[PDB]
Amino acid sequence: MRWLYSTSHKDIGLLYLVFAFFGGLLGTSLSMLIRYELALPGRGLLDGNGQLYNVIITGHGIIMLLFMVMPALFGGFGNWLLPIMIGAPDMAFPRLNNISFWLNPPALALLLLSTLVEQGPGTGWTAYPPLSVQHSGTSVDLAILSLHLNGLSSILGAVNMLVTVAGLRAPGMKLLHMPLFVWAIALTAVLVILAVPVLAAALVMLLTDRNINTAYFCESGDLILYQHLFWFFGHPEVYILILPAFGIVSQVVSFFSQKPVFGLTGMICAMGAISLLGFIVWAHHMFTVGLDLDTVAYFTSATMIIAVPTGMKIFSWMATIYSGRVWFTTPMWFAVGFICLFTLGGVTGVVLANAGVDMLVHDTYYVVAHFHYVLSMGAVFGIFAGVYFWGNLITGLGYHEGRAMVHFWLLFIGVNLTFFPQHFLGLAGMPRRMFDYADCFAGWNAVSSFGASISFISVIVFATTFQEAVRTVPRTATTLEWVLLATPAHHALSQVPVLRTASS
Amino acid sequence: VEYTEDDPKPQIEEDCKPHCVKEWAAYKACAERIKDDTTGQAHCSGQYFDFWKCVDHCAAPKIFAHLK
Amino acid sequence: PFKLPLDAYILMLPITYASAAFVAMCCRVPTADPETSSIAYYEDEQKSAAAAQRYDNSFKQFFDARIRNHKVGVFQNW
Amino acid sequence: ARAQIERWAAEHPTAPRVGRIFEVPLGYVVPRVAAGIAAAGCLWYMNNTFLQTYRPESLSKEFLEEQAKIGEVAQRMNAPPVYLNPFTNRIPGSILGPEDA
Ligand code: HEA
Ligand code: HEA
Ligand SMILES: [Cu+2]
């Protein structure tokens, strides 16, 4: 009853976090089949079934992009933390916040049910036609309807976040005193509202091509138009998933360095510049489709400008740690590991942004290594940094510090030894979305499959970190969630706190 | 290992010859490159030495395995 | 919301450049050769060849001298 | 900024403050990450041994010896055979293949 009928943002955020953990377990399980099939040349445990392998990679990519990272960062930490952080007593629309969650288990059920129907939706997470149209049966329709429901969830959540920020702020607190987590969540909500309905329109076009015999992407239509619409959605999508990670890293780095953030207005202008440039560079996913050279020229020159604000943010994080009083705990390591390993994933993106170089490494495992750096070191590290940081405030349980460092080191060893050899495979010319390869690619695939087992064991050890908590009394803090008890009451901020400017 | 009256070393040297194909290609390129020289002052000793050094490095332990 | 820091204008110069390039690219496409909804456009071979060669030359004629000079790298690799 | 750190340290009493960069001693970390890597290696070995349905015939030792005899040589149906990858194996530009050498 409590968890079914809730209107509190703190219960809904915890439900999002538990759902995202479930989705992460599902995508970990689907990814051991990918690495267990690819360990050796020939035919593995899938018995040479290529359609089942395509189903596995499609479901795994969709699940890890949309039912793990977004429900953890945007829905889990944002809903729990935003009203406490800005001093709002609740969200602007408390029942819209419950339907923003409850459209996600139907979408997950539709996506998991499409795998048991016919031969499944083996198309890739991008679902390009005419391969998606050619699939006969029901599975692809269930997958696209799952994407539609998840997009509706995201749009409703973004509307609630944008109205909660603009109109329920604490008295005296302007748009200068909110933490960078709030600014990141607000910019993510703006990106969601501007980007998700274009995907919804493209998916409606895909259903009308599949089932109504229309002429959007077909014999008489244009198949490049789908890639235009989908990537106009999809390049804002990857920045939707990384901005709350930036906010969590700012809050963690500023906390244990005993210092405020270096360059707050520069940080906000950099996040805004990242949000604005993400809507005019979508066609770097389409260098090999046969666009004109002027279009490719522009989309090459405009993609590399995204390096400057991200570099400013990384250098400001280093300046925040600089000249501080640093104490290294498990969330502090996950932030240091973030800043170290996001830089490695970002620099390969600059290489991929250059179109002539991209003619050699398009649809190779080089791209896979790039986006598993910026997502398993960028978003997963940001998620795990917040789990150990705010965990006794959110859940009411503390964590054993030694086992958490064991989990961090097992994870850090596992994911580095998994995706670093995939750079060498992609440079040599090993293509994506294949379950059998040439005989010479055996060594780095064996190394990467060895690393994935370490990553799985790291996932196992994380369940052993939890233990009983110790509760003390707060006096002062630099943010509002650290003057509250652990756990807070159902109505946190029983009196609305105000911000008083000092007099003369 | 049986010991025979004929020499096993030429056969072992022939068997190690596919392992050094790049050296043989370089030697053949040298031999065809200097075919126009009229001064009498052009040879192919360096590439020949590289190829036979590769062949000897392959074939050295196999010869004494066949020798008493 | 705040005072724009001295960084933000240095950010805004290539951002304005990218926005102007995007607008010019989107604007020049309905003034291109294959954006004609007729077959009778190509039966005038002088005008169509002139239009399509003009579509080739612009934004490429800036690069002809260094294409001929093979300035394809930052360094000089032979 | 100091009081919130001191509050966090009181609610996390298992986190050490002993004056060194790695607060948890490495005598605790190293055997346990070693045990984790050992379990991962056991799983990886079990996949390599008991979960394969087709091992291709180009990885058998007879194929490997007969391929090592040939080397990196590609045949042609309209021309003499050619050395593969002439830069990383340092074939000179006068030599095109073994039979033409
Ligand atoms: C968020 C994104 C994300 C994450 C985390 C991962 C995680 C992993 N992925 Fe993958 N992957 C994709 C996104 C992701 N992946 C996408 C988009 C594709 C494309 C599919 C397509 O082309 O159609 C893909 C495809 C893909 C390929 C290419 C397949 C092919 O081309 O044929 C490979 C190859 O090795 C791979 C392996 C792995 C491995 C070993 C991990 C390991 O890291 C295992 C995971 C371990 C973790 C630790 C992460 C889990 C996180 C949690 C459990 C945190 C949640 C916890 C709380 C909320 C408390 N996945
Ligand atoms: C977390 C998600 C995430 C993030 C943040 C990014 C960030 C970037 N990405 Fe990427 N990308 C993906 C997720 C992401 N990407 C996914 C999932 C795909 C594959 C889609 C598919 O499935 O097909 C993909 C594919 C992809 C492509 C398509 C190529 C192809 O598939 O053929 C390109 C091309 O430009 C690209 C480039 C970039 C660039 C330039 C950035 C930049 O934002 C990064 C900028 C950061 C840095 C550059 C490092 C920090 C900067 C400094 C330290 C300053 C110094 C730097 C310089 C002086 C240059 N990535
Ligand atoms: Cu992109």
Closest among B7, D9, D37 to A327, alpha carbons compared: D9
Q: Which atom of ligand 1 is nearest to the CA of A415?
A: 43
Helix axes A50-64, A139-167, angle to 10 degrees: 10
Query: Distances from the Cα of A316 to the Cαs of A196, A253, A313, C11, in angstroms?
Result: 31, 11, 5, 15
A268 touches chain C (CB under 8 A): yes
Q: Which residues of A are annotated as a binding site for heme a3?
A: 370
For residue D95, give the nearest of B18, B19, B26 by CB distance.
B26
Distance between CA atoms of residues A357 and A360, nearest Å: 6
Considering only CB atoms, A40 lies closest to which of D1, D5, D48, namely D48
Nearest residue, CB atoms, A409 vs list D12, D16, D29: D29
Phi-psi region of A324 (alpha: psi -120 to 50; beta: other; left: phi over 0): beta
User: Using a 6 Å CB cutoff, which residues line ligand 2?
Assistant: A 238, 241-242, 284-285, 303, 306-307, 310-311, 314, 343, 346-347, 349-350, 352-353, 358, 362, 367, 370-371, 374-375, 378-379
- Given a contact cutoff of 8 angstroms between Cβ atoms, the answer to whether A242 and A379 are in contact is yes
Cβ contacts (< 8 Å) between D92 and chain B: which residues? 25-26, 29-30
Q: How far is CA A94 from the centre of its chain?
A: 24
Closest to B15 (Cα-Cα) out of B48, B49, B50, B62: B62
Contact C11 A273 (CB under 8 A): yes
* Helix A442-461, helix D26-50: angle, nearest 10: 130
Whole-angstrom distance, CA of residue D60 vs CA of residue D63 = 5
- CA dihedral for A121, A75, A407, A181, sign (positive or negative): positive
Distance CA A287, CA A296 (A): 7
Rounded-to-integer distance, Cα B25 and Cα B41, Å:
22
Distance (Å, whole) CA A168 – CA A88: 5
CA-CA distance, A254 to A321, in Å (whole number)? 8
Name the residues of A annotated as catalytic. 60, 90, 125, 153-154, 235, 237, 239, 250, 284-285, 310, 313, 432
Give the amino acid at A410.
L
Question: Which positions ≥6 away from A19 have C-beta within 8 Å?
Answer: A67, A71, A101, A104, A105, A108
Judge C/D contact: 3 or more CB pairs < 8 A. Answer: no
How far is Cα A55 from Cα A132, in angstroms, rounded to an integer? 12
CB pair distance less than 8 Å for A176 and C1: yes
Q: Quick count: other Cβ atoms within 10 Å of Cβ A355?
A: 19
A498 contact partners, CB below 8 Å, separation of at least 6 = A170, A171, A172
Query: Per the annotation, where are the binding residues of A for Ca(2+)?
Result: 37, 42
Q: Whose CA is nearest to atom 14 of ligand 1?
A: A64
**Token representation of residue D75:** 């045949």
Pairing of strands D82-83, D73-74: antiparallel
| CA pair distance A346, A348, nearest whole angstrom | 6
Who's near A408: CB < 8 A, 6+ residues apart? A330, A333, A334, A337, A384
CB atoms B26 and D71 under 8 Å = no
Which string of DSSP letters, residue by residue, matches A318-350? HHHHTTS-----HHHHHHHHHHHHHHHHHHHHH
**Which residue ranges of A are tagged as binding site for Fe(II)-heme a?**
60, 372
d(CA D33, CA D24) in angstroms, rounded, equals 13
Which ligand places an atom closest to the C-alpha of A367?
A: 2
CB A197 within 8 A of CB A236: no
Q: Under DSSP, is residue A496 helix (H, G, I), strand (E, B) or coil?
A: coil
With vertex at residue D82, the alpha carbon angle to CA D79 and CA D84, rounded to the nearest 5 degrees, is 145
From chain C, pick out residues whose CB is under 8 angstroms from the CB of A263.
5, 7
Q: How many C-beta neighbours within 10 Å does residue B29 have?
A: 20
Flag whether A touches D (3+ CB pairs, 8 A cutoff): yes
Inter-residue contact D56 to A42 (CB < 8 Å) = yes
- Contact list, D5 vs chain A (CB under 8 Å): 255-256, 258, 327
CA dist D63 to A346, B20, D49, D56, D68, Å? Answer: 43, 19, 21, 10, 8
Three-class SS of B15-40: HCHHHHHHHHHHHHHHHHHHHHCCCC
Nearest residue (by CA) to ligand 1, atom 22, is A124
Cβ atoms of A245 and A383 closer than 8 Å? yes
Distance (Å) from the alpha carbon of A400 to chain D's nearest alpha carbon: 6
A466-467/D82-83 β-pairing: unpaired
3-state secondary structure of C44: coil
Would you call D3 and A475 a contact, using CB atoms and an 8 Å cutoff?
yes
User: To which residue do tokens 């997958």 refer?
Assistant: A143
Distance of CA A9 to the CA centre of its chain: 21
CA of D30 to the centre of ligand 2 (A): 34
Chain D contact for B29, CB < 8 A?
yes
- Ligand 3 centre to CA of A403 (Å) is 36
- Taking alpha carbons only, the member of A86, A224, A232 closest to residue A161 is A86
3-class DSSP state of B39: coil
CB contact under 8 A, C60 and A308: no
Q: Give which of A156, A349, A84 is closest to A242, Cα–Cα.
A: A349
In whole angstroms, what is the distance from residue A326 CA to residue A332 CA? 9
Would the CA dihedral through A109, A111, A115, A119 be positive or negative? Answer: positive
List residues bridging with A43 in a β-sheet.
Answer: D54
C59 CB burial (10 A radius; 0-12, 13-18, 19+): middle
């979960």: which residue's tokens? D51
Helix (H/G/I), strand (E/B), else coil: A242: coil
Instruction: Classify C59 as helix, strand or coil.
Output: coil
Query: Which chain A positions have a beta carbon within 8 Å of C3's beta carbon?
Result: 265
**How far, in Å, from the CA of D2 to the mean position of ligand 1?**
38
Structure-block tokens of residue C70: 């093979």
Please say whether the beta carbons of A483 and A474 come within 8 A: yes
Report the run of H or E that residue C50 belongs to, with start and end: helix C45-57
Name which of D11, D17, D28 is nearest A327 (Cβ-Cβ). D17
Residue holding tokens 């109109």? A167
Residues of D in contact with A453 (CB under 8 A): 39-41, 43-44
What counts of helices (H) and strands (E) characterise chain A?
22, 2
CA distance B21 to B19: 6
Experimental method reported for this structure: cryo-EM
Question: How big is chain A, counted in residues?
Answer: 504
CB A215 within 8 A of CB A159: no
Q: What does the DSSP assignment read for A205-251?
A: HHHHHHHS--SSSSSSS-SHHHHHHHHHHHHHHHHHTTHHHHHHHHH
Triad A391, A312, A408: Cα angle to 5°: 30
The owner of tokens 């099939």 is A37
